[model samples]
Target: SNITYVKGNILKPKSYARILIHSCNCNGSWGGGIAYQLALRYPKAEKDYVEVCEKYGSNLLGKCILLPSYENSDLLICCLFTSSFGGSSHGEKQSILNYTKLALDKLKTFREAIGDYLNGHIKYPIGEYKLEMPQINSGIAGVPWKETERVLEEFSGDMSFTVYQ
Candidate 1:
């Protein structure tokens, strides 16, 4: 597969380094599904995210927030703003997909921007900044994983992700 598939919960720590990405609401909710998983793994970030929602209102599509996990500095959590706090079903579905894609495009740039900080603190670099995600938008967001995968293909050579199942 162009996108590598592995079996496990994404929140669990792994041997090598990778950016753990997932979909989140613009309204700052980590209530259910992947968002809830994030809440369990990274609370400081969940707290920081509420502030993010306050700064950016209900419609923050096509944006992403990157935070270092409290469990391990080497592990970074990326929250893709794909919907409102209510849920993706509460908004336009295509908008969720568009935002998800945008967030993916933003991933590498974020890695670069944080490279200095991550390296200084946790000995992580952009080159070691492997990106990974679950079937984003397919669960809590309600978009089909197949559809999401198609849009993700646009990044083919530019970036390939190890998607968890």
Candidate 2:
């Protein structure tokens, strides 16, 4: 009804359209965590993410950006700008949570704007794609999972996320 917990890797292949959501910093660095794995596997997506971060800077906090994986046609990478920088330099838990909510709101609107038709930016109708993520703010951001889960629950009526361990 809210977030479905799945005990596996988030990067594993799936036969359906899916959005692999993750926490990100405003600065252009996917240095560690799942973001690093993504950068290694999908350099194009990481490139695009870097460009977006460089363009927006700290203005990206409390916002979300969608990038195509390029490696997987059915995969989309959703970056939630919850912190100003990566590693231990991340913001406080409350601030990260606040930005997280704002980012999620932005994501919801972006998906709705794309609608049910395939656009030039994305191969599939992203509006129909499944929402999936790992434990976002709990990683380098240092926020507690339960606190972030509480924020995600607020959007349960609009979207359901498949969370990986």
- Prediction RMSDs, each to the true structure: 2.6, 2.5
- Cα lDDT tens digits, model 2, 1-165, are 698999998998999999989999988999999999999999988888888778779998888888788888899888889899998988888989999999999988777761112245576776789999999988788888989998989997888889998
Model 1's lDDT to the true fold? Answer: 0.73
CA deviation > 4 Å runs, candidate 2: 114-119
Compute the lDDT of residue 18 as modeled in candidate 1.
70
- Index of the highest-TM-score prediction: 2
Q: Where's the lowest-lDDT run of ten residues in candidate 2? A: 112-121
Alpha carbon lDDT of residue 107, candidate 2?
87
Model 1, residue 121: displacement in angstroms?
4.8
Model 2, position 156: C-alpha lDDT score: 79
